[PDB]
Amino acid sequence: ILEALNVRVVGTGDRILFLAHGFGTDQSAWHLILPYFTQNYRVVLYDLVCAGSVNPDYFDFNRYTTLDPYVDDLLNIVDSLGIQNCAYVGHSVSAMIGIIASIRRPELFSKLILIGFSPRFLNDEDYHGGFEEGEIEKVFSAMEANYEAWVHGFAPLAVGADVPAAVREFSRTLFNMRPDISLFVSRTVFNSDLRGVLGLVRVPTCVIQTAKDVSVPASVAEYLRSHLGGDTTVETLKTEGHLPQLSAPAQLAQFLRRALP
Incomplete structure (x- = not known):
């Protein structure tokens, strides 16, 4: 599973940093914000199986039916690298995963920093998710429809801010993803929920909040806390974008170090 989800390591030190990209994107996304830390920690970063920059043939439509296996792999990696003390930075998808894992190994986690994280992407009775059965299927709709078309309209939103580069870079990864894959990964996340499970998290976490996330209501940034x-502590970035790791790494960089370790 090592080369499978092309893991890699940079920098040096007693400190072991980790970076887990989320939906669409791939580890390359951290690039624009990796040098800012490589000279102090030992950064690790892989590429989810769903990722486009990864052999799709490893993605099993009979396996990744939920969010559990995706948490297995993550740990499977950690073991093959034999690690006990580190820092996880998960965004969007990999944000949940860190949460799930963060409880299955309250040991292998010192400071859980989450980015654009969310519990339930579907809004419950007394819960505001920002998306209901309609809102989602509408998206699933054009999605299986014209992928090539769907992406063209999504990128601009997630990124939002006027950053043609940090918005174009997202399409790249978004295309490398075999639609089927994306197609699936979508429904799973949206069909996934880990509310209650949250209280269980022992590790002292740290939620990120942007000006306006196109997929995560604001209120939620509080429900977590x-x-x-x-x-x-749920800090906030004085900038715009769903994926700051690229939209404005400048600030994220600096603000990241203010937590970890």
């Missing part, structure tokens, strides 16, 4: 218990 609500059911965590572990020393979890």
Whole structure:
């Protein structure tokens, strides 16, 4: 599973940093914000199986039916690298994963920093998710429809801010993803939820909040801080974009170090 999801390591030190990209994107996304840390920690970064920059033949439509296996792999990697003390930085998808894992190994996690993280992408009765059965299927709709067309309209939103580069870079990864893959990964996330499970997280987390996320309501940035218990401070980025890792790495960089370790 090592070369499978092309893992890689940079920098040096007693400190072991980790970077897990999320939906669409791939590890390359961290690039624009990696040098800012490589000279202090030992950064690790892989590429989810769904990723486009990864052999699709490793993606099993009978496996990744939910969010569990995706958390297995993550740990499977950690073991093959034999690690006990590190820092996880998960965004969007990989944000949840860190959460799930963060409980299955409250040991292998010192400071859980989450980016554009969310519990349930589907809004419940007394829960505001920002997307309901309609809102989602509408998207799933054109999605299986004209992928080549769907992406053209999504990128601009997630990124949002006027950054033609940090918005174009997202399409790249978004294309390398065999639609089927994306198609699936979507429904799973949206069909996934880990509310209650949150309180269980012991590791002192750290949620990220942007000016306006196209997929994560604002309120939510507070609901998290609500059911965590572990020393979890939810900071905010004075900028725009769903994926700051690229939209404006400048600030994210600096602001990241203010937590980890």
